[PDB]
């Protein structure tokens, strides 16, 4: 249900679930970079 | 093997513990006949015998070893400073020549 699948070769998102290997829309491009998330990570600024 | 192992070896008969480096030259420079100090330079004294754990007795303030127009503390008995459990010692034959030859030997 999420869309966390960017492709450094197809700037578009699928998250086609399991038993569908990777293929970025219309291509192989099996090089998914996965999006970051929305938690308010805290950094000591030192 | 904590207090007798360190300083005395049977393989050589020579100490292993020693001023590795700059302690050698820092202490040397102290000993140099030039260096004249201040009673205000009782500061550096006090990391030694007025100092960290297990040394805070007094120190007998080696006397004012000049009384000129300008009182001053020579550099040696600023090295030779401790004032708990008085002791006695002797030495000689440092690394220099012989004869009062700008003396850096027979301490």
């Amino acid at each position: 249900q999420p869309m966390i699948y960017i492709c450094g070769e197809c700037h578009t998102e699928n998250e086609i679930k399991s038993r569908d290997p990777i293929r970025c829309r219309e291509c192989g491009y099996r090089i998914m970079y996965k999006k970051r998330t929305k938690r308010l990570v805290v950094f000591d600024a030192r | 093997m904590g207090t007798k192992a360190n300083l005395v070896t049977p393989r050589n008969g020579e100490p292993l513990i020693a001023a590795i480096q700059d302690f050698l030259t820092g202490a040397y420079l102290l000993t140099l006949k030039d260096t004249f100090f201040d009673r205000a330079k009782a500061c550096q004294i006090i990391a030694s015998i007025l100092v960290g754990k297990d040394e805070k007795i007094k120190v007998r303030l080696p006397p004012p070893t000049i009384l000129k127009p300008v009182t001053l503390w020579t550099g040696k008995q600023i090295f030779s400073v401790i004032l708990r459990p008085s002791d006695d010692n002797p030495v000689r034959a440092n690394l220099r020549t012989k004869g009062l030859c700008a003396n850096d030997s027979y301490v």
């Binding site: 929305k38 990570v41 600024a45 | 201040d38 009182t71």
Partner: protein, 329 residues
């Protein structure tokens, strides 16, 4: 002798401030005000926007270095200590950007806040000047002049410290934020951005002291000179003036006459950052004598925008008051 330092070709003599009662058989000043508030004075030099300079006259080294060390990192100022994260899409990230921002000087007076004990957001009541940073970059949409500079195809291709919009906590809204809340500099390259990236943050501007993490220093130039007083002995009047005006720094020694040969003695013996070639003419060095004097510990403080340097030096000299009388009961 007694506060005339000497600068031999090999090493500096006369340097310990050897005037304490009972360390000189002249007389030593059981020291305070009457002999000390008469000799003391604070000249001023050039005063200006972020750089200040002045010449205290009559201190000795300990209190002067106490100032120096307090101005550097024993005086508090407003600077970020934490960075909340919202959609940090950008390039290198999360600890440099965190610390980049950690290094940006915010411009709120550090005398209308207090320290921060463990509170709600670690604390959210008085201290948290909270800064919002919402920078978006995209494609400048009218660039028929295709394949041009980044400055012309992008939009806010960089993240300057002018996008640091301030967020109000109902506490502050009426006292400071009329315009005296922005960071000092509206131009700092925090992180370049290329189409499709954004940044969004929250910037917890805690109090702090310089010892903690020196990003709390207000000052840059807290280190100084004594003051040189370069002498002359039966001078080298004539054409030697060329030598004793290129050895010393370019304004230091005048060159006045030729008939009245007059290698023109000292003109400005404070402009010389001691290049000291003069021991290598080998025929002059035995005329000049170099002497930085122990009275005038010439200061020159410069800030980082957080406060005017006068405010910083006054704050330091009063924090020494605080320290000295916090152990005096």
């Amino acid at each position: 002798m007694r506060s005339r330092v000497v600068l031999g070709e090999f090493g500096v003599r006369n340097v310990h401030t050897t005037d304490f009662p009972g360390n000189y058989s002249g007389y030593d000043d059981a020291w305070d005000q009457d002999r000390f508030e008469k000799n003391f004075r604070v000249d001023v030099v050039h005063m200006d926007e972020n750089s200040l300079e002045f010449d205290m006259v009559g201190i000795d080294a300990a209190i002067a270095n106490a100032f120096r060390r307090i101005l550097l990192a024993e005086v508090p100022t407003m600077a970020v200590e934490k960075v909340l994260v919202y959609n940090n899409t950008s390039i290198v990230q999360d600890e440099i950007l965190a610390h980049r921002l950690g290094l940006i000087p915010i411009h709120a007076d550090p005398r209308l806040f207090e320290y921060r004990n463990q509170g709600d957001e670690e604390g959210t009541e008085i201290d948290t000047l909270q800064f919002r940073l919402q920078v978006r970059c995209t494609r400048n949409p009218h660039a028929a002049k295709d394949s041009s500079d980044p400055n012309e195809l992008y939009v806010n291709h960089k993240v300057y410290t002018r996008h640091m919009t301030w967020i109000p906590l109902g506490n502050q809204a009426d006292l400071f934020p009329e315009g005296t809340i922005r960071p000092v500099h509206d131009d700092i390259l925090i992180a370049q951005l290329r189409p499709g990236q954004e940044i969004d943050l929250l910037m917890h501007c805690v109090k702090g002291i310089g010892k903690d993490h020196a990003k709390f220093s207000p000052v840059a130039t807290a280190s100084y000179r004594l003051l040189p007083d370069i002498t002359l002995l039966e001078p080298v009047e004539g054409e030697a003036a060329e030598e004793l005006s290129r050895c010393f720094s370019p304004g230091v020694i005048e060159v006045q006459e030729v008939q009245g040969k007059k290698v023109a003695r000292v003109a400005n013996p404070r402009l010389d950052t001691f290049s000291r070639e003069i021991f290598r003419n080998e025929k002059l060095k035995k005329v000049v004598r170099l002497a930085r004097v122990r009275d005038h510990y010439i200061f020159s403080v410069e800030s980082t925008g957080v406060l005017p340097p006068d405010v910083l030096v006054s704050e330091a000299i009063k924090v020494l008051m605080g320290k000295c009388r916090r152990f005096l009961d």
